[model samples]
Target chain A: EQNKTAATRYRQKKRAEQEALTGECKELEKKNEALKERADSLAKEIQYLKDLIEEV
Target chain B: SRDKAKMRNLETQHKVLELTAENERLQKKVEQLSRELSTLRNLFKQL
Candidate 1:
């Protein structure tokens, strides 16, 4: 009986850790997308600047 | 026994999620660096 109870507690702890990892994964994905968009915008700006310089 | 099995499943899921997240993060970094490299190359060509 005692072993069963301990096992249950350990399982609950594992579940909690899993939940936390899931949350971290979601946040990382969000950050990744944001960074990608920023990079795209910067690329566009660089192109625009290049065009402006060429016009001079 | 059932609980043990379930915990193992959850552990696998968690590991997969972590790897997925890390993969995405690295991919984004690669994209950002590529963009920067292209921009610099263009600028140097102009000079």
Candidate 2:
């Protein structure tokens, strides 16, 4: 049936869109984790710098 | 912090959408498989 074909095509298109969205979501997660790690490292660096400054 | 939280929210939304679409696809596939099984059963009954 035409309706079935249309529905199937629509589902396929939507499925692809969903897949892309999922991939984007994963990429964003990795980026976010990286940012957190960077923030933590920066915090540690700041602490070290503070210690140096205090000793100076 | 807020940016990370926002990204997490978007990720969650995407995950939900992906799962919903996956569920819908699986349901349709199951229905198709069931229909095929029923047809096979009817054929066996005739035999």
Candidate 3:
């Protein structure tokens, strides 16, 4: 009876923690994608500069 | 029952710590990439 209650409580706590971690992971992935896009744009800008210098 | 609770608590704490560390690592990586991007942008503008 008491053990059953304890088990149930433990399961609920674990589920909550897992959910929080999953949320954090999703947020991190989103941020990572944004950073990657920014990096790609920066690389393109650098390449454009290089081509301009070559033409000059 | 008490021991079981304590063990579970410890496990959860450890996992949280691991995730925190990973988050920090990713943050640092993003910071580095941002710095690189800024440097490139500056150099591009100078041209």
Candidate 4:
């Protein structure tokens, strides 16, 4: 079974690399979603602020 | 086998890349909003 370890190592390598990418991908999703909501809130605040321009 | 793994995960890699770019876009949007808010705040305090 000389080649057994070869396949085993290959599988582990793939898993490690895949997990690394997926981990970052998930983090990005979380961050992106947060930013999306933040933009909404900030827009509302800015819209109110712009009332000065509207009134003037 | 190694290269095959890369190929198998090509779809995932693309997904990650897309999210990465979206993250930057979202960041710039927020930064711009923050800058505008500050500018407006400054405008209200006329000297």
How does model 4 fare in lDDT? Answer: 0.87
Q: How displaced is residue B1 in candidate 1, in Å?
A: 9.9
- Please provide, for model 3 over A1-56, each residue's C-alpha lDDT reduced to its tens digit, 9 standing for 90 to 100: 99999989988987787667666666765666676666566667667766775887
| After superposition, candidate 1 runs with Cα above 4 Å error | A1-4, B1-47
lDDT of 1 by residue, B1-47 (tens): 76886776677677667767666776777677677768767776864
lDDT of 1 at B18: 73
The residue-by-residue lDDT of candidate 1 on A12-35, one tens digit each, is: 997797677667666666766676
How high is the TM-score of chain A in model 3? 0.76
TM-score of chain B of each: 0.66, 0.80, 0.65, 0.64
Which portions of model 2 miss their true places by more than 4 Å?
B1-47
Candidate-wise lDDT, in order: 0.72, 0.62, 0.68, 0.87
Lowest summed lDDT across 10 adjacent residues in model 1 chain B is found at B15-24
DockQ, all models:
0.15, 0.03, 0.21, 0.76
Candidate 4, DockQ score (0 to 1): 0.76
Candidate 4 docking quality: incorrect, acceptable, medium or high: medium
**Between which residue pairs do clashes occur in model 4?**
none
When 1 and 3 are scored with DockQ, the better candidate is 3
lDDT of 3 by residue, B6-44 (tens): 676666667666656765676676677667666756866
- In lDDT terms, which candidate is top? 4
Error of 3 at A46 (Å): 1.2
Every model's TM-score? 0.51, 0.48, 0.54, 0.76
